[PDB]
Amino acid sequence: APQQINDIVHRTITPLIEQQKIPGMAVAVIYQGKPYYFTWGYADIAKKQPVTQQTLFELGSVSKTFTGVLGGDAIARGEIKLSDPTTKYWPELTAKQWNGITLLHLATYTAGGLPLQVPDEVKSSSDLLRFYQNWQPAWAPGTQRLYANSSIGLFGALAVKPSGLSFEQAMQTRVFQPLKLNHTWINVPPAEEKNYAWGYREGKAVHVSPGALDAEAYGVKSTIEDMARWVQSNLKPLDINEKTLQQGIQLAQSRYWQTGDMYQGLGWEMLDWPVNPDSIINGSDNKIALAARPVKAITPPTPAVRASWVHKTGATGGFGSYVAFIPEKELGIVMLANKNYPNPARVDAAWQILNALQ
């Protein structure tokens, strides 16, 4: 790496790892569209396995960006429309609260207060149907944003229905394979387990548990190298040769709703660049990020704005991840850690690094 990149990264991350007690971390900086990698510490404390460029981390909700792009690709293929009623793809959702709830609302957390988590007791396809049938919206559709796995999770399940493929196969075939994300997995194969970091929660080694709509909302595992490649693909979709995929990436960065100075895309969230660091830093904090907030519709949605800080935080019980990029500066960052540490600390470090290089 250029010594400038080396120095800001180390000067920023070293203190972060110390303060937050992070066992292991990988960082990629995308600078003028070239990746630079950094790693520290342990993928597996017990077995003394270091973090490397090949280590798999749980992305947690950064997975929503893949779901949003896969959904965008389905739109581009003419398979679904964001204006379609939810019931078009799940006619068994007959409870009348679903009248007027579209794929758009599901994708963008504006259905009317779908819950943050799908309950644990929901397992089968029939459990899930009952869950959404019984759900009572707090609000009319398209009025309030409440970040929710059960909202975008369902968008992901329904978006792949016309394709005939499982969500995993659609993702593999239409997103991972075309982008050469060859070490990115919904289900980690046995052959790759050697590279799968442990998460650490209270110093216990943990991996994410199976859950309804897990793949769609929080179930991708990836390497810093693949995640650098994901960032490059989203920074410059016009370099992508697969037409519907290029378009899908563009659709996931359109601005559908605004709350405060934040705009909701499909999985990605966006602010105008230059951003006020306090606005993203404090904004990443969980009970701003996870709070009920009125939304203003963007009618019609603004296509991907190049001068944006585009980002997503993600967590599992044992991992904390963050991705942020600025299309107009060909600049981006990925931070993957096997501890779930506070979001503001993530955005703060990312901001310090990208501002220095911008």
Ligand X SMILES: *[B]([O])([O])[C]([N]C(=O)[C]C1=[C][C]=[C]S1)C1=[C]C(/[C]=[C]/C([O])=O)=[C][C]=[C]1
Helix-strand-coil split of the chain, %, nearest 5: 40, 25, 35
Which run of H or of E encompasses 74? helix 63-76
- Is the CB of 75 or the CB of 152 nearer to ligand X? 152
**Strand ranges, E, within 45-169:** 49-50, 56-58, 144-145
3-state DSSP assignment of residue 351: helix
Tell whether residue 315 is a contact of ligand X (CB under 6 A).
yes
The minimum distance between CB 291 and ligand X, in angstroms, equals 12
117 appears as a binding residue in the annotation:
yes
Site string for ligand X, 121-160 (x = CB under 6 A): ----------------------------x-----------
b or e along 113-134 (b: 16 or more beta carbons within 10 Å of the residue's beta carbon)? bbeeebeeebeeeeebbebbee
Does residue 129 contact residue 86 with C-beta atoms inside 8 Å? Answer: no
Q: Which stretch binds ligand X (CB under 6 A): 29-37, 236-244, 261-269, 308-316?
A: 308-316
The minimum distance between CB 315 and ligand X, in angstroms, equals 4
- Is the CB of 35 or the CB of 314 nearer to ligand X? 314
Site string for ligand X, 45-64 (x = CB under 6 A): ---------------xx---
The minimum distance between CB 208 and ligand X, in angstroms, equals 6
Tell whether residue 267 is a contact of ligand X (CB under 6 A).
no
- Is the CB of 189 or the CB of 210 nearer to ligand X? 210
The phi and psi torsions of 184 (rounded to 5 degrees) equal -125, 130
133 appears as a binding residue in the annotation:
no
Give dist(CA 60, CA 244) in Å, integer.
Answer: 25
- Is the CB of 164 or the CB of 203 nearer to ligand X? 203
- Describe the crossing of helices 63-76 and 149-159 by its angle, rounded to 10 degrees: 40
Question: Binding residues for ligand X, how many (CB under 6 A)?
Answer: 11
3-state DSSP assignment of residue 286: helix
Which of 225, 132, 226 is CA-nearest to residue 176? 226
Which of 356, 354, 358 is CA-nearest to residue 280? 354
99 appears as a binding residue in the annotation:
no
User: What are the distances in angstroms from CA 226 to CA 28, 32, 144, 288?
Assistant: 10, 17, 34, 30
Tell whether residue 258 is a contact of ligand X (CB under 6 A).
no
Tell whether residue 277 is a contact of ligand X (CB under 6 A).
no
Tell whether residue 317 is a contact of ligand X (CB under 6 A).
yes
Whether 61 is a known active-site residue: answer: yes
Tell whether residue 340 is a contact of ligand X (CB under 6 A).
yes
Q: Which residues lie near ligand X (CB under 6 A)? A: 60-61, 116, 149, 208, 218, 314-317, 340
Q: Which residues are annotated as a binding site for a beta-lactam?
A: 61, 117, 147, 149, 315, 340
Question: Catalytic site residues?
Answer: 61
